[PDB]
């Protein structure tokens, strides 16, 4: 039972209980007024101030209002600014502040709250774990790694710290090293470890080192509801979408797009080659640690449904052609990009992040031998001026062992069963 009342708040516990009763009975408007009255009457009261914040929080949920929730976030801070705040209340108030900041996407704000929490409570390992998450959410992997190293130095069997440390190691390409942390962390069963991200990356790391137990973890991640299937391991999904590794144009319904790509393929090719020849810096190396070896770069025209204007200067006719197809130019969970791969390249088996897109590949310069792509259990080759269509949320793998370069054009489309409102509302990836 948390101790939320300081000495003075115990003397007004009756008033505080009455207001909290209104709030828990669901009479949130009355509760807000009751706690506002307690705050004006007892301006230093931490329990009254916390009640005001919790009422605003509840109101925000009732109205699904981010504005009301921002109000609550400020009142939770006010609580911590008052005199003589009981430790349990201080911790609850600032924790909920950080949690609602994260819910709103204020990740830098959440991080600052979490840093303050760890200063105020230096022996709370769970708060350190939460701080590490804060760092991860702003992209500060170096500081996250230090936090989890500290956690493990004091509580070496903490499963949450183990899985997050392994995640960080894996992301740094420390594949072998990451495996024991990911595995031990998932096996710990500790809260926060039963997370698709850790199954996904444990299996990927094992595949990379040749350890055959990878699909054991894929099956268990499936059994625990993280993956639609053992083959399809995307983690940002709309459930229910038709799932198959390979699609025909008519199955997708995007027949006009496929026809435009194939009928105009030489123009698309020639713009890509001109960029290779005189603007090669527009092609950026693949930067998601997906390769075993080899050279692979991409020249991106659209990402997250936004045209790259400078890029489109390099492929102006191709970009004009594509503007007629919002199913791709507005695909905020895919890209439109040229992709060049050179001999000696092997892309590790891997999965895209979302089942909400399908990926078209138009062949532009395809050596007669040496290039192929596997998706799930079917392996195919490209052809110049022909489109292949696969669902990259299924595990897929690519090889380039020709004697010259291989150029394709990649056009992501919205999964065809997604409705217009889904296409408008789904968070971009």
């Amino acid at each position: 039972k948390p101790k939320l009342l300081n000495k003075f708040d115990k003397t007004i516990k009756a008033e505080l209980d009455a207001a909290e009763k209104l709030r828990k009975r669901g009479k949130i408007e009355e509760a807000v007024n009751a706690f506002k009255e307690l705050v004006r009457k007892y301006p230093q009261s931490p329990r009254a101030r916390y009640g005001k914040a919790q009422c605003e929080d509840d109101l925000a949920e009732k109205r699904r209002s981010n504005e009301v929730l921002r109000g609550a976030i400020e009142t939770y801070q006010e609580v911590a600014s008052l005199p003589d705040v009981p430790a349990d209340l201080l911790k609850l108030s600032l924790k909920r502040r950080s949690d609602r900041q994260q819910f709103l996407g204020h990740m830098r704000g959440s991080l600052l709250t979490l840093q303050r929490l760890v200063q105020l409570f230096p022996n709370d390992t769970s708060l350190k774990n939460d701080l590490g998450v804060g760092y991860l959410l702003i992209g500060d992997n170096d500081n996250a790694k230090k936090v989890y190293e500290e956690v493990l130095s004091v509580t070496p069997n903490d499963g949450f710290a183990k899985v997050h440390y392994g995640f960080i190691l894996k992301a740094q390409n420390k594949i072998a090293e990451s495996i024991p942390y990911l595995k031990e962390g998932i096996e710990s069963g500790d809260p926060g470890t039963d997370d698709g991200r850790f199954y996904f990356h444990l299996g990927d790391a094992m595949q990379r080192v040749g350890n055959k137990e990878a699909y054991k973890w894929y099956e268990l991640g499936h059994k625990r509801g993280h993956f639609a299937s053992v083959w399809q391991r995307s983690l940002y999904n709309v459930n229910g979408l038709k799932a198959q590794p390979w699609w025909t144009p008519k199955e997708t319904g995007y027949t006009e797009l496929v026809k435009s790509l194939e009928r105009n393929w030489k123009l698309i090719r020639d713009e890509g080659l001109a960029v290779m020849d005189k603007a090669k810096g527009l092609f950026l190396p693949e930067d998601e640690n997906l390769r075993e070896k080899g050279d692979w770069s991409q020249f991106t025209l659209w990402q997250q449904g936004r045209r790259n204007e400078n890029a489109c200067k390099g492929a102006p006719k191709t970009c004009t052609l594509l503007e007629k197809f919002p199913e791709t130019t507005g695909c905020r969970r895919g890209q439109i990009k040229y992709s060049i791969m050179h001999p000696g390249t092997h892309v590790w088996p891997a999965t895209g992040p979302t089942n909400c897109r399908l990926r078209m590949h138009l062949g532009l310069v395809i050596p007669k031998e040496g290039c192929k792509i596997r998706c799930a259990n079917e392996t195919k080759t490209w052809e110049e001026g022909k489109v292949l269509i696969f669902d990259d949320s299924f595990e897929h793998e690519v090889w380039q062992d020709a004697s010259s370069f291989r150029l394709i054009f990649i056009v992501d489309v919205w999964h065809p069963e997604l409705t217009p409102q889904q296409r408008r509302s789904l968070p971009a990836i």
């Binding site: 925000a60 699904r64 209002s65 981010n66 929730l69 994260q102 819910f103 709103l104 996407g105 991860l136 959410l137 702003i138 992209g139 995640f167 992301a171 991200r197 996904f200 990356h201 995307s234 983690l235 940002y236 693949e286 998601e288 640690n289 997906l290 990402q303 997250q304 890209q335 891997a350 999965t351 895209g352 992040p353 979302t354 990259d392 968070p427 971009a428 990836i429």
Partner: peptide
């Protein structure tokens, strides 16, 4: 996460949250 999940799933989170 200051990096995006384009082809893979390598970031801790792939989306930016917007509340309700």
């Amino acid at each position: 996460n200051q990096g995006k999940c384009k082809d893979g799933l390598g970031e801790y989170t792939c989306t930016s949250l917007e509340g309700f």
